[PDB]
């Protein structure tokens, strides 16, 4: 159903977003409930709704071909796959719809954000940055002096897609705007390195304290940074079932890297060591120390974003609640102590 795929994608209309689901454009929509078969069409619906296609006279063949090439540029580790990218892109669309980004950022910045969302984890292998370095990967070999190893590769892969014949959805920009767009993507993608976020966190607080100034150029940069990290973590803004299930995949991925490190004779981080990792406290810590501050910062800049923070805080309480279930009380389901 692969070339079947390009053809349908291109020669039918692009569905109106509302026809996808009546709640497609609300903060309570879970993008991962859309069949993976429909997600490319969905990307195009959002692009058309956000008016970028008919704004920039983008080649529908080029655009549909971009989309499928982006999708195909993901591997299939448990977490860092296309459905991640898709729901991350979808949240960006939500932000643009519910928060009115056009009053905050230039059309080009928003386009670069959405597109960086599609591409921000391309060709991920289920290993992190410290793995690249520790294992002397060829990615660590090329990007050897400044960290953000994977993020540098994700941007590199996005670049190589745009430079594939019939995939340059930017080949309509002036050379000036083309450069600007590439520098935008690099910055937004790079911002998805958690180390980056921790570096600029103080500056984000400040901007939120004094208030976003649209004539401040450094505010534009910080906003786009905060918005992108809000997109990368948006699974935490949905239901309990979503955080629960996203913990499954995360930990499945992490533990595989740990098993591999052990085999190479490295010592894995605890959260990657399936023998040592206590998932409930790892989640609460992650929630309390990473994701919560992101959505609080977003609530401070954007008062309509408040429901998202309160979702994320409610998801944390719930890990607190079910946290006792990770000590086996009574007997296992089968009434057996064999597992001993
Ligand atoms: C930090 C390690 C904990 O990992 C996670 C644990 N629970 C949920 C989760 N959702 N995404 C992550 C995660 C996995 N790897 N990375 C790099 C992230 C992550 C983290 C932050 C950002 C904003 C800067 C972007 C991505 N998660
Ligand atoms: Mg990433
Ligand atoms: Zn990501």
Curated annotation (Swiss-Prot):
Belongs to the cyclic nucleotide phosphodiesterase family. PDE2 subfamily. This is cGMP-dependent 3',5'-cyclic phosphodiesterase. Zn(2+) binds at residues 84, 120-121, 232. Widely expressed. Expressed in brain, with high expression observed in the corpus striatum. Also expressed in heart, placenta, lung, skeletal muscle, kidney and pancreas. It comes from the Eukaryota. The active site is at residue 80. The chain holds residues 579 to 916 of 941 of the full protein. It comes from Homo sapiens. Mg(2+) binds at residue 121. Residues 3-326 form the PDEase domain. cGMP-activated cyclic nucleotide phosphodiesterase with a dual-specificity for the second messengers cAMP and cGMP, which are key regulators of many important physiological processes. Has a higher efficiency with cGMP compared to cAMP. Plays a role in cell growth and migration. It is linked to Intellectual developmental disorder with paroxysmal dyskinesia or seizures: An autosomal recessive disorder characterized by global developmental delay, impaired intellectual development, language delay, and early-onset paroxysmal hyperkinetic movement disorder that manifests as sudden falls or backward propulsion, eye or head deviation, and dystonic limb posturing followed by chorea and dyskinetic movements. Some patients may also develop epileptic seizures or only have seizures without a movement disorder. The lineage of its organism: Eukaryota, Metazoa, Chordata, Craniata, Vertebrata. Homodimer. Changing residue 271 to L: Decreased 3',5'-cyclic-AMP phosphodiesterase activity. Loss of 3',5'-cyclic-GMP phosphodiesterase activity. The GAF 1 domain functions as a dimerization domain. The GAF 2 domains binds cGMP, which acts as an allosteric activator. Changing residue 236 to I: No effect on 3',5'-cyclic-AMP phosphodiesterase activity. Decreased 3',5'-cyclic-GMP phosphodiesterase activity.
